[PDB]
Amino acid sequence: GSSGSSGRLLDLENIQIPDAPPPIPKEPSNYDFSGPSSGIEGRGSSGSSGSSGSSGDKERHGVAIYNFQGSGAPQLSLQIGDVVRIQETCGDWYRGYLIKHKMLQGIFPKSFIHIKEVT
């Protein structure tokens, strides 16, 4: 085998994060979702059935690095040090929910989500 030189040996590990987070990007174009017409959310209706078999149980593990403050869906709030279950990915925004608190679901900027790939 053949290997070159290295240069990633320190005593204070710390991700290469900037002093401050960049200006959140612009919302993605008219989403291309698909399902039952949404509107009776306030009224309330049971029925959260979907994937029956094994369509694709391969989600992405991310972590919030910057404190995001939203107002309401589809916008979702996030807190640094929080992990979310990434299901889909549109434009410059992710689609999922807070694993710790599923009670809240929506989208968020990818620039705020740290995709962990330790595997």
CSV table of C-alpha atoms in Angstrom, one decimal:
chain,number,residue,atom,x,y,z
A,1,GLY,CA,0.0,0.0,0.0
A,2,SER,CA,0.9,3.7,-0.3
A,3,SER,CA,0.2,6.6,2.0
A,4,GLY,CA,1.2,10.2,2.0
A,5,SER,CA,1.7,12.7,4.8
A,6,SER,CA,-0.8,13.9,7.4
A,7,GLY,CA,-1.7,17.1,9.2
A,8,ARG,CA,-4.7,16.6,11.5
A,9,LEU,CA,-3.1,15.8,14.8
A,10,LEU,CA,-4.0,18.3,17.6
A,11,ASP,CA,-4.7,18.3,21.3
A,12,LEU,CA,-7.8,20.5,21.0
A,13,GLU,CA,-10.3,19.0,18.5
A,14,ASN,CA,-12.8,21.5,17.2
A,15,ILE,CA,-14.8,21.6,14.0
A,16,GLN,CA,-13.8,24.3,11.6
A,17,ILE,CA,-16.8,26.6,12.5
A,18,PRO,CA,-16.8,30.3,11.7
A,19,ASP,CA,-17.0,33.0,14.4
A,20,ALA,CA,-20.6,33.5,13.4
A,21,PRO,CA,-23.2,31.7,11.2
A,22,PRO,CA,-23.9,33.0,7.7
A,23,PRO,CA,-27.2,34.7,6.5
A,24,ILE,CA,-29.8,32.0,6.2
A,25,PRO,CA,-30.6,31.1,2.5
A,26,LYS,CA,-33.8,31.9,0.7
A,27,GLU,CA,-36.8,29.5,1.0
A,28,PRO,CA,-37.0,26.8,-1.7
A,29,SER,CA,-39.4,27.2,-4.7
A,30,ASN,CA,-43.0,25.9,-4.5
A,31,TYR,CA,-42.5,22.6,-2.6
A,32,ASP,CA,-43.4,19.5,-4.6
A,33,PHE,CA,-45.1,17.6,-1.8
A,34,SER,CA,-47.8,14.9,-2.5
A,35,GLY,CA,-50.7,13.8,-0.3
A,36,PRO,CA,-54.1,14.7,1.2
A,37,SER,CA,-55.1,18.3,0.9
A,38,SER,CA,-53.9,20.1,4.0
A,39,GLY,CA,-56.3,22.5,5.8
A,40,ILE,CA,-58.2,20.6,8.5
A,41,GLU,CA,-55.1,20.6,10.7
A,42,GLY,CA,-56.9,22.8,13.2
A,43,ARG,CA,-60.0,20.6,13.3
A,44,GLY,CA,-58.0,17.5,14.0
A,45,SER,CA,-58.2,14.1,12.3
A,46,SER,CA,-56.6,10.7,13.0
A,47,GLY,CA,-54.7,8.8,10.3
A,48,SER,CA,-50.9,8.7,10.3
A,49,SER,CA,-50.5,5.5,8.2
A,50,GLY,CA,-48.0,5.3,5.4
A,51,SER,CA,-45.0,3.1,4.6
A,52,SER,CA,-46.2,-0.5,5.2
A,53,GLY,CA,-43.2,-2.6,4.2
A,54,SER,CA,-39.6,-1.6,3.8
A,55,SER,CA,-39.5,1.4,1.3
A,56,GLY,CA,-36.3,2.9,2.6
A,57,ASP,CA,-35.3,2.9,6.3
A,58,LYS,CA,-32.1,4.9,5.5
A,59,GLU,CA,-32.4,8.3,7.0
A,60,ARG,CA,-29.6,10.8,7.7
A,61,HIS,CA,-28.3,11.8,11.1
A,62,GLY,CA,-27.8,15.5,11.6
A,63,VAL,CA,-27.1,17.9,14.4
A,64,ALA,CA,-28.1,21.6,14.9
A,65,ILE,CA,-25.0,23.8,15.2
A,66,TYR,CA,-26.8,27.2,15.2
A,67,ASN,CA,-29.8,28.3,17.2
A,68,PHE,CA,-32.6,28.7,14.7
A,69,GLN,CA,-35.7,30.7,15.5
A,70,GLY,CA,-38.9,30.1,13.5
A,71,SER,CA,-42.5,31.3,13.6
A,72,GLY,CA,-44.5,28.4,12.3
A,73,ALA,CA,-44.7,25.6,9.8
A,74,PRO,CA,-43.5,24.7,7.4
A,75,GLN,CA,-40.8,26.4,9.3
A,76,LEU,CA,-39.5,24.5,12.3
A,77,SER,CA,-37.4,25.7,15.3
A,78,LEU,CA,-34.1,24.2,16.2
A,79,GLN,CA,-31.6,24.3,19.1
A,80,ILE,CA,-27.8,23.8,19.0
A,81,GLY,CA,-27.0,20.3,20.1
A,82,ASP,CA,-30.2,18.8,18.8
A,83,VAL,CA,-30.5,15.9,16.4
A,84,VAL,CA,-33.2,15.6,13.7
A,85,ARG,CA,-34.3,12.6,11.6
A,86,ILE,CA,-33.6,13.6,8.0
A,87,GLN,CA,-36.2,12.0,5.7
A,88,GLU,CA,-35.9,14.2,2.6
A,89,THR,CA,-33.8,16.9,1.1
A,90,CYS,CA,-35.0,19.8,-1.0
A,91,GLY,CA,-32.9,22.6,-2.4
A,92,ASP,CA,-30.9,24.3,0.4
A,93,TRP,CA,-33.3,23.0,3.1
A,94,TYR,CA,-33.8,19.7,4.9
A,95,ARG,CA,-37.1,18.0,5.7
A,96,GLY,CA,-37.8,16.1,8.9
A,97,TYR,CA,-38.5,16.6,12.6
A,98,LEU,CA,-36.9,16.8,16.1
A,99,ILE,CA,-36.1,13.2,17.2
A,100,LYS,CA,-36.1,14.4,20.8
A,101,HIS,CA,-39.4,16.2,20.3
A,102,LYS,CA,-41.5,14.8,17.4
A,103,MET,CA,-44.3,17.1,18.6
A,104,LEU,CA,-42.6,19.6,16.2
A,105,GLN,CA,-42.1,18.9,12.5
A,106,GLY,CA,-41.0,21.0,9.6
A,107,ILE,CA,-38.0,22.1,7.6
A,108,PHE,CA,-34.7,23.9,8.3
A,109,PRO,CA,-31.5,25.3,6.6
A,110,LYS,CA,-28.9,22.7,5.7
A,111,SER,CA,-26.2,25.3,6.7
A,112,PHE,CA,-27.5,24.8,10.3
A,113,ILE,CA,-27.6,21.0,10.1
A,114,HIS,CA,-24.3,19.1,10.7
A,115,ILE,CA,-24.5,15.8,8.8
A,116,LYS,CA,-22.5,13.3,10.8
A,117,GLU,CA,-20.7,10.6,8.8
A,118,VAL,CA,-18.5,8.9,11.5
A,119,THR,CA,-19.3,5.7,9.6
